[PDB]
Amino acid sequence: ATTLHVCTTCRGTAAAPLAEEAGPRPGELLAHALSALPVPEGVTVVPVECLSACTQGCAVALSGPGKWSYVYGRLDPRDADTILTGAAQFEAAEKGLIPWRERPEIFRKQCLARIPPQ
Amino acid sequence: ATTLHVCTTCRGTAAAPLAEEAGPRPGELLAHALSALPVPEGVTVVPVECLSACTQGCAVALSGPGKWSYVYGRLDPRDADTILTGAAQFEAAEKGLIPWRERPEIFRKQCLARIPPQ
Numbered sequence: 001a002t003t004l005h006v007c008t009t010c011r012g013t014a015a016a017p018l019a020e021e022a023g024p025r026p027g028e029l030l031a032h033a034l035s036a037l038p039v040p041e042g043v044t045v046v047p048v049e050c051l052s053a054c055t056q057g058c059a060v061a062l063s064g065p066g067k068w069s070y071v072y073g074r075l076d077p078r079d080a081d082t083i084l085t086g087a088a089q090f091e092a093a094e095k096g097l098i099p100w101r102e103r104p105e106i107f108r109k110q111c112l113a114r115i116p117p118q
Numbered sequence: 119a120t121t122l123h124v125c126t127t128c129r130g131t132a133a134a135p136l137a138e139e140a141g142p143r144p145g146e147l148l149a150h151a152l153s154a155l156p157v158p159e160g161v162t163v164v165p166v167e168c169l170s171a172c173t174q175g176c177a178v179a180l181s182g183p184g185k186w187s188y189v190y191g192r193l194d195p196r197d198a199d200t201i202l203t204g205a206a207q208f209e210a211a212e213k214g215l216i217p218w219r220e221r222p223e224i225f226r227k228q229c230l231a232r233i234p235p236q
């Protein structure tokens with residue numbers, strides 16, 4: 001059982017005083033993109049108000065009983081399909097530990113933290 | 119029950135090509151400082167090799183059954199006693215949610231991620 005938490009408040013990493021306007025929050029756009037796609041077996045997408053990774057939006061988290069927990073950031077709504085593929089690999093992997101060379105590039109380069117299984 | 123993971127591999131946030139080399143890695147020193155200090159009830163200090171927060175050393179994580187998980191970074195070995203105090207407040211708070219203004223400054227400003235309870 002894999003849970004993919006997606007922050008719905010996240011703003012992008014652009015400099016707010018310099019960036020052009022707002023619109024819907026990227027985290028909200030990412031959440032919607034994740035919900036439009038087929039959710040893999042074993043994965044459940046759960047929106048959250050904040051993953052305390054605000055400086056690295058968009059942020060999502062992967063966790064499950066007996067597995068490592070992961071937080072990834074600096075994501076974009078267009079990463080939704082790769083995120084769900086990653087979440088599937090997370091569900092299949094032993095303890096959530098995906099072999100490094102098999103992880104999507106965003107999981108290798110944009111991981112913010114991991115936590116040992118409870 | 120509360121587990122405080124501490125990364126023993128962490129180096130500081132100083133520019134590696136420009137700095138010095140010191141002695142042991144700061145994450146080692148932080149782990150040793152934590153284990154030498156008295157530990158509040160219900161808290162266990164667990165050394166780990168890496169919390170995948172390497173750009174934000176030193177890194178520690180708090181987790182416990184039914185509680186939010188947290189990762190804090192950019193810590194120093196001298197923070198060990200404040201970290202342990204935070205661990206006690208985390209152990210005492212329902213779901214690990216310490217009242218905001220009661221949290222140590224390091225927990226308010228240097229949290230890298232939080233994950234909802236499993």
Ligand code: FES
Binds near residue numbers: 009050054057059
């Ligand atoms: S706004 Fe998304 S992690 Fe805080």
Ligand code: FES
Binds near residue numbers: 128145167169171177
């Ligand atoms: S070396 Fe400390 S989090 Fe990776």
